Structure formats: C-alpha cells, structure tokens
Amino acid sequence: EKSVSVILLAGPKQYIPLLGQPIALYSFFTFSRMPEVKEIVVVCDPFFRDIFEEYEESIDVDLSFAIPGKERQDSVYSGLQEIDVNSELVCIHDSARPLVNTEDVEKVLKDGSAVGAAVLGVPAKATIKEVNSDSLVVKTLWEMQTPQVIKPELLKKGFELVKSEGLAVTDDVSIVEYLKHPVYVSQGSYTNIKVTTPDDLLLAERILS
Amino acid sequence: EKSVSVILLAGPKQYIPLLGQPIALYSFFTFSRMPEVKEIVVVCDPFFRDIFEEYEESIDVDLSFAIPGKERQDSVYSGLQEIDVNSELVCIHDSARPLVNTEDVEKVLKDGSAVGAAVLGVPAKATIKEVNSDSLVVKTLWEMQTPQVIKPELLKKGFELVKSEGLAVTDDVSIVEYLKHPVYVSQGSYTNIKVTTPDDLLLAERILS
Ligand SMILES: N#Cc1cnn2c(O)c(Cc3ccccc3)c(Cl)nc12
Ligand SMILES: N#Cc1cnn2c(O)c(Cc3ccccc3)c(Cl)nc12
Ligand SMILES: [K+]
Ligand SMILES: [K+]
Ligand SMILES: [K+]
Ligand SMILES: [K+]
C-alpha cells in the first residue's frame, strides 16, 4: 500500500471527452482508487493542470505535476524527478489509454515488483515480420501497452547509461533494453487501446458499454 | 497484360455492405479493371456465388470459383487449382481488405514479378517485441497485408514441401518461409485495413471519403 508512484503522461487527443470526461481523467481515476498508489505525478502542459487539479481533495493520492519535454523519454524523465524519496515502484502510463483495467494494473504492478521491470502486452494479431535494408523478409511477437512498471533505481540507471554513453532511444522499452535486467511482459487485454483519432474514441464508447 | 490470376479469399464480415456494396466486391472490382489481371478465382461458400456472379459480363476478367477449406492455406490451395495453365503470377487477396489501392496492387505485382514473391506491408507503428517462454522481452518490423503475389510454380513447390515433409503452417507467409526464395515487402498504405468488426466498417466509410 502507498508503494507506487504513477507518472501519468499527458504532454490534443488525450483531452477530447469520452462520455463527457476528458480521456486523461479515466486512467487518472483508475490509479487514484488503488491503495497501492501513493501519488500521481501528472506530466502535462501547465495550460491543462486544472483538468486534474479540480479533484485533488476527492482522490486518495498525492497529486504532483511535471513539465513535459520534447520526446516521450524526456517527459518520463521529468515525472521521475518528482516521486516520494521512498517509492518502491514507478508506474508509467500513457494518458491516451483511458480504458486500462484495475485488474491489469494490479498484474503489471505485481510483475514489476517481482521482476524489477514489467509492461502490459497482448499477442500481436497481425502477421508481423522483420524486414532488412533490401526490403526482404528476414527468415511470438507481443504488442506493448502501458503501464510500464519499474523500480526507480533501475530506471535511473537506465537514464544514466543512455546519457553518459550517448545511446539511441528508439521505442518505448529502448532504455531498459541497454541494461541486463529482465523485462517481464504481463498479459493484458485488447480493450486497453490507445485513443488517438475519432474512430478510436468510438471504440472506447463501445468498450465502455 | 492478362498475366495475373487473382485468388480472392472470401470463405459473415466480408459481405456486410460498405456504402451499399458488400465488402468483398470492392477489391473484386479493383482487380477486374486492371489490364494485368486475366482472371479472378473467387474462393467462397457457394451460398454467396451470386454476389460475384451478377457482374461476369460487365467485368473484363474471366470469373472462376473454388470451394474453401478449413484453414486459410487450404482456401489458398483450392483457388490455386483453378488458374490459367500459363498465368505468370498469382495474386492472393483477403476480401476483408476492400480498400486496397490500384497503385499499391500495381507495386506488389511489379515486385512479385521481379523477385518471385512479394507482399504489401506497412511499418508497424506500435512497440512490438519478441517474448520468450518465460514471458521476458528478448533483447524494423512490418505489418503484412494483401495482396500476396507469387509465381505459381514457387507457391506449388511451397505446398509440395509443407505436404511431403509435414510442416507447420503458422502465419500468412509461413509456407514460403520454408523455401530459400526471397520474399519482398512492397510498401503499402495504412488505409488498406482489414474490415472485420463494425468499428472497422466505420473507418472504411471515412477512408472512402
Ligand atoms: N519514452 C520512453 C522510453 C524509452 N524507453 N523506455 C523505457 O525503457 C522505460 C522503462 C521501462 C521499460 C519496460 C518496462 C518498464 C519500464 C520507460 Cl518507462 N520509458 C521508456
Ligand atoms: N494461408 C496461408 C499462407 C501461409 N503461408 N502462405 C504463403 O507463404 C503464401 C505465399 C506467399 C507468401 C508471401 C508473399 C507472397 C506469397 C500464401 Cl499466398 N499464403 C500462405
Ligand atoms: K541492473
Ligand atoms: K489507433
Ligand atoms: K526456389
Ligand atoms: K481490426
């Protein structure tokens, strides 16, 4: 209980309402009601702080804020600077995923605690293949979602390594890929979609019923 | 000209209308108007033959039919048995992809002719990772679409090898993966979606405007 700090990424499609509520507030509330969660560090343009700020006394978590940066990793880093000095786990979530299930958050938190780093994923349904520089097929794949859950010292070491040795950040689990620590893939739900265009918004409404 | 035989897979979501026309007819017509295409072998439950049969004298291709089988590869094989004895290329298409562009069909036909086997693909947008049996991340991916275009002798040899040596067919390019022949990935369009649920159907309508 109160061992997890959520970094909620909300640096605009994550504020378009879903049944009257901005998309970013759904996951915000899902996390707030979990007794595991001590605090939520919201990463957002200060223009939208109000959207979250209205609910501070009514939620049972500490609310903090962080300034976004140029790339997703910069926004992750900024949020990381604000967590309780004794948080055992950081839980990084894309606010564009409003429909994440509490049960799946529970699973990835559990796996993150056990393993050190964990991320929600689902089996990739489509035929997906590695392709080389000459456009030829190179002769189980999982699609990643969020939360991404990691022990703060682990993530700090990852940022430290990328920084000092000047490494290339390419995708959403690139930083830990440079470390030798294992990353567990917690099996999630296909309903935990990223809601970035009006067609997704419609999906979200059907899932919400 | 008249060098390509299309195997149109329509073995029910591919007959739900899109702006009044069953989904399966969109690609059917796209292929019919191409002077490269000699014939279309439609693979469908005979219950729906009429849907295609109505247009035979008005299209400029020979129309043939084949019975589906249990798995997609069986349906591919059945269609293969019906093509002109002198077709230089077979063009396999999932009728659930109604929005394929003529220009992209032209590209994959060109690449299939040059290389021997080619398939439309797009860069996979999501973070996708290989995961091992212990649920851990294994430390460019492309999403495949159709058409899949192949020289008929190449595809026949592939079915022959899988059959005689009893190999496991897993995904949509599995059969050729056993051969040493290269498979080219022709860059397609994100609009060439597979339309399997009412939300896709809505996507299709927006793309169609
Ligand atoms: N942006 C961004 C980004 C790039 N890499 N990377 C990363 O490795 C983690 C850490 C992490 C990875 C997997 C599972 C949990 C945590 C997080 Cl949270 N973000 C990023
Ligand atoms: N079902 C099914 C199926 C499984 N494998 N496989 C395959 O290799 C090809 C041939 C092909 C592959 C890549 C590019 C063109 C053709 C086709 Cl057409 N279908 C299948
Ligand atoms: K380590
Ligand atoms: K999407
Ligand atoms: K060969
Ligand atoms: K779909």
From Swiss-Prot, chains A, B:
It is found in: Plastid, Chloroplast stroma. Its cofactor is Mg(2+); Ni(2+); Mn(2+). Divalent metal cations. Mg(2+), Ni(2+) and Mn(2+) are the most effective. Co(2+) and Ca(2+) are only minimally effective. The keyword Transferase applies. Its EC number is 2.7.7.60. The record marks 194 as: Positions MEP for the nucleophilic attack. GO terms for biological process: isopentenyl diphosphate biosynthetic process, methylerythritol 4-phosphate pathway. It comes from Arabidopsis thaliana (Mouse-ear cress). It catalyses: 2-C-methyl-D-erythritol 4-phosphate + CTP + H(+) = 4-CDP-2-C-methyl-D-erythritol + diphosphate. This is 2-C-methyl-D-erythritol 4-phosphate cytidylyltransferase, chloroplastic. Its main location: plastid. It is an enzyme of class 2 (transferase). Induction: Circadian-regulated with a peak in the late period of the light phase. The lineage of its organism: Eukaryota, Viridiplantae, Streptophyta, Embryophyta, Tracheophyta. The chain holds residues 76 to 299 of 302 of the full protein. Expressed in leaves, stems and flowers, but not in roots. Transmembrane segments: none annotated. Belongs to the IspD/TarI cytidylyltransferase family. IspD subfamily. Keywords: Acetylation, Chloroplast, Isoprene biosynthesis, Nucleotidyltransferase, Plastid, Transferase, Transit peptide. Enzyme of the plastid non-mevalonate pathway for isoprenoid biosynthesis that catalyzes the formation of 4-diphosphocytidyl-2-C-methyl-D-erythritol from CTP and 2-C-methyl-D-erythritol 4-phosphate (MEP). Is essential for chloroplast development and required for pigments and gibberellins biosynthesis. The keyword Cytoplasm does not apply.
